[PDB]
Amino acid sequence: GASKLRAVLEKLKLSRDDISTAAGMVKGVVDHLLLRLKCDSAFRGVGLLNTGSYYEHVKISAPNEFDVMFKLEVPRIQLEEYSNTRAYYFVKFENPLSQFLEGEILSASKMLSKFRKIIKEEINDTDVIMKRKRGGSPAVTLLISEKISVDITLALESKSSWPASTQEGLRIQNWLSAKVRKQLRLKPFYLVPKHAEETWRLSFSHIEKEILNNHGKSKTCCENKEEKCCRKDCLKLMKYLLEQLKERFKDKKHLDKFSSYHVKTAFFHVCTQNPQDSQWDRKDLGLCFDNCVTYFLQCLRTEKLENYFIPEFNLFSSNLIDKRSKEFLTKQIEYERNNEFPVFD
Ligand SMILES: Cc1ccc(-c2cc(C(=O)O)c3[nH]c(CN4CCN(Cc5ccccc5)CC4)nc3c2)c(Cl)c1
Ligand SMILES: [Zn+2]
């Protein structure tokens, strides 16, 4: 444990907890968008994923940045792995999405261009302007007033068994048990637009809250005084460590490809590595956060960070992130641990 780390966590808790109208402004915009979308022939079956919450945030230090998902149920889906990528698929199949068919394969580009057209129109009809940024996921980014920012992703939902590329993924059997792994694999999966082309990426982002809210080997982890663990605290600190380094070097482009997602992935790989709750004692926050920082550094150096669900998908391959960018971050983190983590004060 370290006192500095707890002070950072106390600051992050107060920004998250204090009175804010922001969620209300976002709910207003989202509820309005959903109504204009449910009238469209193609987006009629659109539903907000997790209709009840605090809307989900991409940043632990930014209370004004929101992350939202609109899902479309896609029964009787045929998936085809593109170029042996393990995570990117062609979507094959009347139905409402038959309009976006280009032969047999579903067009994401055309679906996103339509989704954008409808949102861009609703923006004019409280001031909400669509941020100029263009990319498949998030499909849309809105700036509400001056401070509030909302990412909106359009995703396809499938209730069929997870694709074969996931068979060895979610290696939680020595931590959460074989019984829990089997229960989670019965949950749906998502397909989001992203190029490896008219390819969709497999997404399991919805599995995170399931694990975070029931994260111990003991069924009573964090339910009493005797069983207080630091797993959630280590993830918040790992995320905050990346966010602060990204902010510091925003004028350069060396940390542009790194995201909270990479930090989450490496963190859950440490959970598999250290499955016992005794390896996560609240008193050992310092050493636990150190095990996290060390593992992430090893990922950067070896250029290896497997998708937690798709083991043959390396998020740190040279083709996705060049070595110079990795070596830059490796140098910045190594500086932070050798200087009592200055980004935290
Ligand atoms: C044990 C475990 C479980 C889950 C994950 C996981 C996996 C994925 C994945 O893609 O498989 C993730 N992706 C991202 C970033 N996304 C940005 C866009 N958001 C849209 C949204 C917004 C609101 C409501 C739904 C959706 C969701 C969060 N964190 C992810 C985390 C990991 Cl690592 C380990
Ligand atoms: Zn716990």
Query: 3-class SS at 151?
Result: strand
CA of 123 to the centre of ligand 2 (A): 42
User: Which of 151, 187, 190, 261 has most ligand 1 atoms within 8 Å of CB, for mutation?
Assistant: 261
Q: What is the CB-side half-sphere exposure of residue 138 using CA atoms within 13 A?
A: 19
CA-based nearest residue to 44, from 53, 56, 35, 52: 35
Distance CA 304, CA 242 (A): 17
Instruction: Say whether 10 counts as a known binding-site residue.
Output: no
Q: What H or E segment, with its residue span, contains residue 66?
A: strand 65-73
Distance CA 242, CA 256 (A): 11
Dihedral, CA of residue 178, residue 56, residue 265 and residue 247, to nearest 10:
-170
Judge whether 86 and 310 are in contact, CB under 8 Å.
yes
Instruction: Copy the structure tokens of residue 244.
Output: 């602060």
CA-based nearest residue to 307, from 189, 216, 198: 189
**Residues with a beta carbon under 5 angstroms from ion ligand 2:** 216, 221-222, 229
CA of 207 to the centre of ligand 1 (A): 8
Instruction: Say whether 221 counts as a known binding-site residue.
Output: yes
CA distances from 167 to 73, 90, 192, 267, 277 (A): 23, 19, 20, 21, 26
Judge whether 293 and 330 are in contact, CB under 8 Å.
no
Q: What is the CB-side half-sphere exposure of residue 79 using CA atoms within 13 A?
A: 27
- Give the pocket of ligand 1 (CB within 6 Å): 49-50, 56, 67-69, 153, 203-205, 207-208, 211, 261, 264-265, 268, 308-309
Judge whether 262 and 329 are in contact, CB under 8 Å.
no
Cβ partners under 8 Å of residue 317, min gap 6: 303
CA of 185 to the centre of ligand 1 (A): 16
- Closest ligand to C-alpha of residue 305 is 1
Instruction: Say whether 41 counts as a known binding-site residue.
Output: no
Cβ partners under 8 Å of residue 231, min gap 6: 215, 216, 271, 280
- Position in ligand 1 atom list of the atom nearest CA 204: 11
Final resolution, Å: 2.1
